[PDB]
Amino acid sequence: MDYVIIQSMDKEVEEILTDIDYGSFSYDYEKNTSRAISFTVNKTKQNAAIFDLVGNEAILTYQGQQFVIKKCTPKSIGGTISKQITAQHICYTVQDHVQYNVKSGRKKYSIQTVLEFALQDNVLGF
Amino acid sequence: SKDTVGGWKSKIGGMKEWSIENDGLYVADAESHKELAKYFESDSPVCVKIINQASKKGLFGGLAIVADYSFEAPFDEAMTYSVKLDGMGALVDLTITEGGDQMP
Amino acid sequence: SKDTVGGWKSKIGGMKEWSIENDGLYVADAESHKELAKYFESDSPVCVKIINQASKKGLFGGLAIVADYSFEAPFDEAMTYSVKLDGMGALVDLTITEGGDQMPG
């Protein structure tokens, strides 16, 4: 689906974020560098019910991919309330898990061992 | 239509309009002239009707505004008057239709 | 109204206006012509009336301005004058209303 699905921070409610300014919508990808979506949402009658849910730490499903909102900028100019939403791919949220243990010394590792060490006992389902 | 063989112009009828111009001798105290003056002053519609007074058959009827009411007084002739009436709508053609035979 | 059955244009009355044109023989020593010249010289809206000197009744009255005041002297005729007055405001119609029977004297 080409529209955006909005799931709240507490995952209690999941709906469709309508009346998105698709002209301002943009999807940026760069290998090993970035993966994000940015757009602007105006509060209208159609999305007034769920316009309060779209905020930081909310989840947006777009083309089958999940993006966590990392920057929300509500703005009020007269009668129009607009939020500038920037969301990064959920993979980068893996930075919330830290491996405190250290394998001291110089040693020849492979990618498999380092990856297993990095994502050991994850609580975020990675 | 410039694309039709023949090179001839064409026209189509549209809105219709009508007016009545009357003129004659003016007598101030005549009740018809008093009614005309009242109609001119009051800016009210006047119901005018063209009659064939000899054949006892009506000809035309309608509502009008008194657009002009002028008088001339030459020193060697009789004082005259001229009136112009403009229609606000359909001028009923009593000849083709039926009725409108009420006369003084 | 093009959206109403029929096909005839509809009109209503608008603003009213009036004027008086008077021409005749000119005598420069007449009091009336002196008053007309004075009125034409410097503004001074003039009260004018049209009356019936024989029937002893007035017809019209109102204020006006002297828009034109010209003369003509053909060599084989009397020397004539013409004058034009443009109305200011309402022209009282004394034929229907009462009063206004005052006459020169």
Binding site: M1, Y3, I5, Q7, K11, V13, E14, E15, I16, T18, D19, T44, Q46, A49 | D43 | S1, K2, D3, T4, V5, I12, G13, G14, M15
Partner: protein, 272 residues
């Protein structure tokens, strides 16, 4: 005779009836403002059109006001200005086409004083949705006593049109000039009562709405715009988030996974 009807705060006011001295001479409607999203590639000919869209347009009404006297004229002008200009958009329609209404906002229009008591006016209403819609929705019966339907509204004179169905496979006729799509801020409601796990399929469009819970005949599933609810409770998490749309003309619909289906459609027709 011409007249203009205004729907304001749930009340229908005739423009001539409200103000006796004001009469509507004529009405007119600007053509749809088609605009193709052109993209230009330098060095090539013409443009590459995107998706054709329709811009807001203007509905005009030429009228005149005839008052008794000057104070009456000023009072009538003030009252007309008070009546026409409201905070929120309202609805308008005309006697010539009494089956089609427009959601409009007024525009600044000045009285042209011709005489001491008469004044010409040309009211202009901006319709911003870019389209006109029928006065009644699909739920209204197509009966004479309803007094809502008039000729020229694309009603099919070959078969019956009903929007309540009892079987699992049927056809629905969208008579509008645009494909009904709630994503485009269109109005569309679906009310269904059945038993089991339902799935709605629009074959002509190719869309499918899926609900992943068991339903009873006492529970009503209401899809309004882009919100699916049961008993006025949001259940968007338990669906596939798909939304159905109504193409122009006939749409074939198939319901799967439920029995004794009772499905009703409630949407207005989109004209232009």
């Amino acid at each position: 005779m011409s007249d203009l009807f205004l729907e304001l705060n749930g009340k229908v006011h005739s423009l001539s009836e409200t103000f006796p001295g004001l009469s509507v001479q004529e009405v007119s409607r600007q053509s749809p403002q088609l605009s193709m999203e052109t993209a230009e590639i330098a060095g090539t000919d013409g443009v590459i059109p995107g998706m054709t869209q329709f811009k807001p347009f203007i509905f005009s009404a030429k009228c005149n006001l005839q008052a008794l006297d000057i104070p009456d004229y000023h009072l009538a002008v003030r009252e007309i200005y008070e009546f026409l200009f409201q905070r929120d958009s309202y609805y308008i329609w005309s006697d010539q086409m009494p089956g089609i209404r427009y959601e409009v906002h007024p525009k600044p229009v000045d009285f042209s004083r011709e005489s001491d008591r008469v004044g010409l006016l040309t009211i202009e209403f901006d319709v911003f949705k870019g389209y006109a819609e029928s006065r009644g929705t699909s739920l209204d019966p197509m009966t004479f006593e309803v007094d809502l339907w008039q000729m020229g509204m694309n009603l099919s004179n070959r078969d019956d049109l009903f929007y309540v169905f009892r079987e699992n496979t049927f056809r629905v006729y969208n008579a509008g000039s645009d494909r009904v799509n709630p994503l485009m801020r269109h109005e569309l409601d679906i009310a269904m009562t059945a038993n089991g796990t339902p799935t709605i399929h629009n074959l002509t469009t190719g869309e499918s709405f899926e609900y992943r819970k068991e339903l009873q005949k006492t529970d009503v599933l209401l899809l309004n715009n882009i919100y699916p609810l049961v008993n006025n409770r949001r259940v968007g998490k338990d669906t596939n988030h798909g939304i159905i749309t109504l193409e122009k003309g006939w749409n074939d619909f198939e319901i799967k996974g439920v029995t004794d289906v009772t499905i009703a459609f409630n949407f207005p027709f989109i004209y232009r």
